[PDB]
Symmetry: D2
Subunit: 482 residues, 4 copies
């Protein structure tokens, strides 16, 4: 066929669906996925259009991290016209995609100096280097916030033109825009990709049906690699994607108020972070925890809920303490095993992947969609995304030594972010006794590959059988590529 | 036949519905209320069959409190045959009403000595006085629990034959038993009770309909007095009932385990308390917060959720920290303004009330149902419930001095239960500076009536307009009865 | 006679002794006081030459506070030449008076935003207004410090030419310089000043002797008003001075290191503050608590010791935790009842006072000495000391409303500086319930006079008999002056 | 006879020798400063049943030590009578309390505090000692933080306390009355040849001749005897168990009628208040084994002691005046048991390594050594504790490794810390490996007790290497 099947109904599937439908009016594009959006990252997102706010010293210390940052800055420029084009297919009563134009980054001491102080400096540096509009402002001038004095910020940074969207209104606008462009929504899941003679034939659905296609775009979030890995040789040629389980909440504020801007800290222990995204109608979004899990999980832990609420009520606004909990949200950030996204073509003709975007696939969605659509039309898409081709040896963006320093520092940061109260000698003792066991795990996993810190901590506290399976995986990948 | 309308589909409405339908073949009985059970206490309950566990030194210091306790002990004896009679109308696949036969009461130091130490002694005394089977056990012998050592119990009390039911399975069994007995469920709300010539005519429903009846039983939980107060003179003759908003949660335990018994503390600050009720299928119930509100609220505050989770994870089982949150539940304990229930007949022929049961209407339900059904058949029901007739001057069960000591002590207990960490001189200072403002409020509200501590704290932190309205209410009640 | 007696052997007595001896070589100057220096402020001082570091928003909001600040800035200019003139009478082996040239002010969140944030801004403003050399610096550039990350500074201010002296080496240098200039040390205490026909005759000593003099300078620290108040009418014409009991400690650092600068916060709750003053030979000085006491006290409380050690180990250097405690020091800051010093002449010819200097008598010593010596020579001394003449109606430097806001804010600051951990609603409740009792005390004490916050808190927690005695004192002062 | 050392043990044996051998000259060495002195820093509790731990009573050597403590308690009333008899009313009273209350709170590890409270109750019942578990509400005087309050309390009848300062004064006075001579210098060297003591070189250069030398020099005792031939690897090393205590003038001049204490806690730390005359209370006491002596409190020790006392015993102590921070060295034997009795050198005796309870055992230990010196057999239970011995192995390496991880965790729970709930289990798992590795590296046969193992873990690599050599030289000497 010249038929296109998009597998997945998150921001990436729907965004690529809209761009394919709009630019290929002569082709049938069908998008698979259910309204439940099981383990769905996009519906649990605030979401911040995070570029400069997402800067960490650790990310900007690697070439791959600097490349990722450049793409985030490029994506930000597409959002105004993208939103215009999505709202155009609706009416006033569909509501507004954009919920804030600006972001304030707060620096408080409820965290590790080695992360929060380094990350605040790295954000300031990245803004100056980009000539991006921003101002360090007096904390007293930040409107709305009412923190616990012992948890209060002492520095604040206003980032102009870095805002937020309502992820629910965005998903609704994308579905409507997809239909307007001639797309068809088929609310079932793909169970199997069918291929022979090095080319896609189509997709078996979970209602037993077979849908034929010349093109299949896998944008199934954390399920994307598990779906393609069934095809011959692809188990050790497409980097694994795990579930970065994240917890967020919708809160009806005590007085119906909200901040005019996004409020956030820099990224914290293991890509956790504290932020408040404005919503319409006396609701605010607060987020968001992160924990890499080797198996999917669709419910918040008690610990995640308490940590998120404690951070927001102390560090942002004590008024949230008396505010009503409307919804606890859980979704899976697609967490690539080598720390970088899986975007583009495959050794199978007509098979494409758009996944592994972790914290910022929603922000990058208009750029990533346009890239894959350019590739499908025989173009070269966006310069700088070829490094992130899905069929690849695992990337080694950092030394084993760098990752081992990072994992101990992030482990300690879970304490300082609580925040704990310990005898003053205990942290130094814990630091010294964490180094050995993480060095031992890293050496045991593989002679060539080291999992990034966020994955290494999950592997450290997984079962021995799960660690053994990963040792086998890394060995089979080394065999395939070397 | 002579029609009966039961207004309300909680435990009390359904329990009286079942008893009327089963004992009165001459009556058509119709029960009003919606499946949503808005503000419903019963669905948010664990629930503990609380008699001896509910004992406090303060309750047993008043004649009215001792009378209430006696009824709780009598109700416990009805439960085995009551459950038998409800399960008999179903099949194995409907599930079991009883989830535990026994209770363990734990004493830890995450609370005020003036409440927890006095209440533990009062429970021991009440058990010995009743010749009830119990024993003080070694904490090491309490199975399953895994508390934070700094939050651990140092004393434990096993109460034999004081257990728990699944409130959801009880409600299902009551509805099924009601239908089997010839009852009719009409899923609408009463908006108005119609009366003329000193007699009930029936009920206007919220779909505009009028249902005629010779008998109307109001068991609408926290809405019960607001519904009858519209009838002539009844605004100052039926004590007000407020919303004792309570938060509980269902948790899927990390390993599917649960305790074999109820685990609880004694009642704590303002009729808050910590307990875990076993459930079938790897779930546990944890509860339960309490806050008297002058207006209803159907969502948990952030503060209530954090406090409940923090108490359960530290004081009962650290494993709950990594367990999955299934559901946050919110319901309104009917909180009578004078601290005692509203049970029996009215100055309006055929108008009955079953409400204001606060923490233990579910436990007392089989006894309370049988009492009201006996009264409706011209009997005298249960000895000792006449004091709790719904049409009455406000009861004064305590001196103003007693309530003022209680409210300061319970306020301080909110600190010790957190638990806070303060400079050692601060608690004595706070105690001294709380006395004056509560004495001033009590003196300003009325020359004769004092709200019980749980209501006094809610009034202290209500708006000036709400305090003024209550001053007018107490003055109009004094006028009516004196 | 033309003989001069200086009563008191602290920094002020010895400083004025040195200036009199050096400028009047034809006159006999005798200095009284014993080597033990009971309750002595000077030996317990670090000491910081505190001018800009002592700035608070509250002080600079009053005309009297702006006058005090101007004098501190004038005194700072005298110190380099004053030290040169004192070291000139000794040799290298006598040790160096100056222990640091510069001060770093740190801003952390272990305190009340309403004090620490306002005071940091006030220091920056006062430095710019004075054209003083200073720089806001990166916290990472502050050498030596190793705080708890949860207690770490996020802003830092370098003040050039605001340093510290070794108070012990200063006292030794002053005694040596006094003897070199012809001064005589008589190690007894004055019991009585003798005066008749409106002129001083001399001093009765505690060994029964009488020393004649034409001039008596009272610099007896917290005992100075008690000594002059015995003269006719002077009991209600010389403002009372109380004991500002302060605790400091000498610590031998784990590795013999110390910072190159003074390290301090701004002044905190009730003129407490955290600072570390470098010393020679592997010692550091840490201070300093403050409590106004209605009677003198010569030993640290447990609370004062714990608070000082906890602040220093968390906020400055965790290495101090493992460091050896050499000495806990206690001295009495002369605390004037109206909040301002007693400097200059009297209605008695030849009677002078130099006292009530509270936190900065040592810093102001060279200026205060020169002022009194100018007055004794028939000059007008230093411009801006006239409001601080010792024979005066009590100053009212603030409105009762200003002091009431200050005392509640400083009370709350004792919590945030601990730092406490409380439920988020508790601080607002405590703030509301503190206002009434302090307003009631202020209204009861006097219709015209209000004690400054530091004294008001001591009176609030004193016995009813001590409050009654103060009501009588204020009434007798009003009678004398109105 | 020369007694080397002027602590409770030296003076107690001095008094017993002087009183029972009136025909002999007994001279006692030591200076008024009592540098690193344990006795002056002691409360002191006459600790027998209060000193019981589950871990101590699980070993034969620990049960033997406990039996001696119970025997010593019976000697105290007549011993005090005999010391006060040499003075007047104005010298003050040695005894400050007759009874002890043991409090159980949750400011500690369940694995220590809960096990130790049960072990105390059991040891009291087994001994037929008078005691009763009492309502916490019936404990007079105490005013704890409610979050730090006890929920169980135990009254121990006839287990009390003495004023260590008044005891030392009474011992010196009683020594002089009995014909003893005080020579305020330190021994630098014991002189011996032909397998017999000749006497002592003092630090002022003098030589004092003697037929008997009793070494009771606290934590310095083994270092002094180790200089004699072969004795470096035949007398177990003694280290400094540095302890911090404080004298506090109470806000209202009040005090409790009894000793107030918890059971022993992390690494033989413990919280107690000992009554004193004149509106003073003693609070103690920290413990840290140090490989070199230390004569000043750390900031951490002072804060921990004050924080424990103000929260767990009486909030009134917060506003009370600090009179004195005291520091002394508990003689900490490397194998965990005392060094009492005779030597392979004729006329050389040792009384040391008593750690937490040398003062309590002093009248029994004095009488034992005096019996031995007179050709008797002294007290039946003391033979295992002879000073010239292979290092005792009272516990398995596995037992000590469980203990050291549990005591490390207890330092957290006693603070008390506030941590994420997953952190303690993680720390427990990551402590096991490094302590197992240290124990295996130190020796194939000897394991230091937990209190010493933690000090070795955090010592310099050179100090660990020196201990590996010491253990190897001891193994060589005895096997
Ligand atoms: C708590 C949280 C907060 C976040 N905050 C932000 C933020 O502030 N800014 C930001 O830019 N991003 C944010 N993100 C999202 C992040 O950018 C993600 O990388 C992004 O949403 C990924 O989108 P996706 O379309 O790849 O995956 P998803 O959004 O997970 O979409 C995948 C969809 O495919 C479906 N699917 C799965 N298997 C199949 C199958 N076999 N067949 C068909 N359908 C299938 C799933 O059910 C799901 O609906 C957040 C995410 C989380 C969890
Ligand atoms: C968190 C929590 C924990 C609890 N734990 C326990 C426990 O362990 N043990 C125990 O014994 N009890 C427990 N209780 C419950 C307590 O006993 C209550 O007193 C009891 O459930 C009250 O029963 P009810 O039927 O009067 O009220 P509800 O259960 O509130 O029932 C009233 C019903 O009437 C409906 N209604 C309201 N207005 C109208 C109208 N106009 N027309 C028709 N229907 C209307 C409501 O929607 C509701 O469904 C708990 C309650 C809470 C909130």
């Amino acid at each position: 066929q010249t038929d296109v099947i998009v597998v997945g109904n998150g921001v990436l599937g729907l965004s690529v669906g809209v761009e394919i439908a709009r630019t290929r009016p002569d082709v049938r594009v069908t998008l698979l996925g259910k309204p439940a959006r099981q383990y769905g990252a996009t519906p649990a997102a605030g979401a911040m259009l995070g570029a400069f706010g997402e800067v960490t010293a650790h990310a900007l210390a690697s070439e791959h991290g600097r490349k990722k940052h450049a793409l985030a800055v490029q994506a930000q420029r597409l959002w105004p016209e993208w939103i215009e084009s999505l709202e155009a297919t609706g009416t006033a009563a569909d509501g507004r995609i954009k919920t804030a134009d600006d972001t304030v980054v707060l620096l408080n001491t409820v965290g590790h100096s080695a992360l929060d102080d380094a990350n605040f400096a790295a954000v300031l540096t990245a803004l100056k280097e980009a000539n991006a509009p921003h101002e360090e402002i007096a904390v007293e001038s930040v409107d709305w916030i009412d923190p616990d004095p012992n948890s209060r910020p002492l520095r604040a940074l206003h980032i102009e033109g870095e805002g937020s969207v309502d992820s629910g209104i965005l998903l609704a606008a994308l579905e409507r825009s997809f239909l307007q462009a001639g797309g068809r929504l088929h609310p079932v899941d793909a169970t199997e990709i069918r291929a022979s003679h090095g080319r896609v034939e189509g997709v078996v659905t979970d209602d037993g049906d077979f849908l034929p296609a010349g093109h299949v775009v896998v944008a199934a979030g954390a399920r994307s690699q598990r779906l393609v890995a069934a095809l011959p040789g692809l188990a050790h040629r497409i980097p694994r994607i795990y579930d970065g389980v994240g917890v967020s909440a919708l809160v009806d504020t005590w007085d119906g108020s909200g901040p005019a801007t996004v409020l956030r800290t820099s990224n914290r222990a293991f890509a956790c972070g504290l932020h408040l995204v404005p919503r319409a109608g006396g609701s605010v979004y607060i987020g968001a925890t992160n924990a890499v899990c080797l198996e999917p999980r669709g419910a918040a832990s008690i610990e995640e809920t308490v940590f998120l609420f404690n951070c927001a009520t102390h560090q942002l606004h004590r008024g949230l303490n008396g505010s009503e909990l409307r919804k606890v949200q859980v979704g899976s950030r697609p967490a690539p095993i080598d720390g970088f996204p899986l975007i583009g073509g495959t050794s199978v003709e007509g098979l494409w992947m758009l996944s592994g975007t972790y914290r910022d696939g929603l922000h990058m969605s208009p750029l990533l969609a346009r890239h894959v659509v350019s590739l499908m039309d025989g173009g070269t898409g966006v310069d700088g995304l070829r490094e992130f081709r899905p069929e690849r040896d695992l990337i080694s963006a950092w030394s084993r030594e760098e990752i081992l320093d990072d994992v101990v520092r992030h482990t300690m940061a879970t304490g300082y972010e609580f925040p704990w109260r310990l005898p003053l000698e205990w942290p130094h003792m814990m630091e010294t006794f964490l180094q050995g066991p993480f060095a031992e795990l890293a050496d045991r996993l593989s002679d060539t590959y080291t999992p990034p810190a966020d994955l290494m901590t999950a592997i450290m506290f997984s079962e021995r059988e799960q660690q053994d399976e990963l040792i086998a995986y890394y060995a089979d990948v080394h065999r395939e590529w070397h």
